[PDB]
Write a protein that binds this ligand. Sequence first.
Ligand SMILES: *CCC(=O)Nc1cc(C)on1
Ligand SMILES: *CCC(=O)Nc1cc(C)on1
Ligand SMILES: CCC(=O)Nc1cc(C)on1
Length: 337
Amino acid sequence: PEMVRGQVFDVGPRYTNLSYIGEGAYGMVCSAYDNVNKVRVAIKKISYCQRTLREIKILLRFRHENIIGINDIIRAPTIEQMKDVYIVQDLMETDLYKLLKTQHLSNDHICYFLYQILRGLKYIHSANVLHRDLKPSNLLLNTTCDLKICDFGLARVADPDHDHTGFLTEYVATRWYRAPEIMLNSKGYTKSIDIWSVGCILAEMLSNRPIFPGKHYLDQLNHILGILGSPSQEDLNCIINLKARNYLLSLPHKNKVPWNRLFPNADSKALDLLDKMLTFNPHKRIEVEQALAHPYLEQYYDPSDEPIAEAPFKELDDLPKEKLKELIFEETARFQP
Ligand SMILES: *CCC(=O)Nc1cc(C)on1
Ligand SMILES: *CCC(=O)Nc1cc(C)on1
Ligand SMILES: CCC(=O)Nc1cc(C)on1
C-alpha cells in the first residue's frame, strides 16, 4: 500500500502518483492519478463520526453542477477489515479561502461566484437541507472559476417549528459566518441561517477580509451590531426570550455603518443584495430564490437552468458506534466491484 508523509494512504492500484495537498476537516488529502478516467483527482482519507455518514449520504443523493460529487469510495470488503474510508472527488485548483488570501476579485468574478453559490444553495434548500457551515474554504473552484459547494458534515434537514432556543446556546458551525439569531434564540434549523453565511461571503469577496471576525461566541454578535446598528423596536419585539431581548436592550445605541462606506468600490446592486442577505431579523431576510432574481445577478438569472432536487431529503447522533460503522459500510457498498 502507498505511503504519504510516513502514513498509510491506501487507495489501491486505480489511484497512483500521490501528492500531498494538505489537511482538511477530516484528515490527509492527496491528489492522485485516476488510471481509469485518466485525470488527476482529489482523495480524502477518513479515519465513526456521524459527520462522515451525513456527508456521504447527502453527497451521494445530490446531483448538481455547483455541489461537489463523490466519484468513488475506497474501503475494505468487509466491516471487520474496514478501518479507513477514502473519498474520491473532482480535483479543484483552489477554494475561495485561498483565493481571497492572495487575489483581488473583479466585480465580474464576485457576481459569477455569488450566482453559482446561490444556484447550488437553491438545490440544497429545495431538498429541505441546510448546509449550516458555508464559508470560503467550503467553496471549491477549478481553473475556469466553476464553483462547487463542499463539506456537508454539519448539514441538517430543515426544522423551523423546532428552531427556538435560549440565549447563549452553544453552536458548532464556524463562528465568523453565524447569523445573529444563533447567539440569541436560534438552533440554526431554518434556511435563513445559510443566507446569512452567503451574505458574509459576499462581503468578504468585496474586500478580501471577513466582515465579522469575532474572537469568541458573544463578540461575534457585537461585530454584527457594530455594522448593522441597534435592532429596531419591531425586530427586538420578535425576540420573545427575555434573556436575549434584555441583553440587546442593555447595549448602548449603535449606528448603522452604510454599506457604501465599508465597500466604496462595490457595485451598488451588489450592496443592495448584501443588505438583504445581512438582515438582522431572519424572518425579513431574503430567500435563495429571491436572491437569484435580484438585479445584481440579472446577467445569469435563469430559473429554468437553476434545478431543484427530485424529492426532499430525510437520526444519527442517537446510534452506537457499531451501528454507525455498519451504516457507513452499507452507504459505500455501490462502489465495490
Ligand atoms: C470541502 C472543503 C475541502 O475539500 N477543503 C480542503 C481540502 C484540502 C486539502 O484543504 N482544504
Ligand atoms: C416578529 C415578526 C416578524 O418579523 N415576522 C415576519 C416578518 C416577515 C417578513 O415575515 N414574518
Ligand atoms: C475536492 C477537493 C480538492 O480538490 N481539494 C484541493 C485541491 C487543491 C489544490 O487544494 N485543495
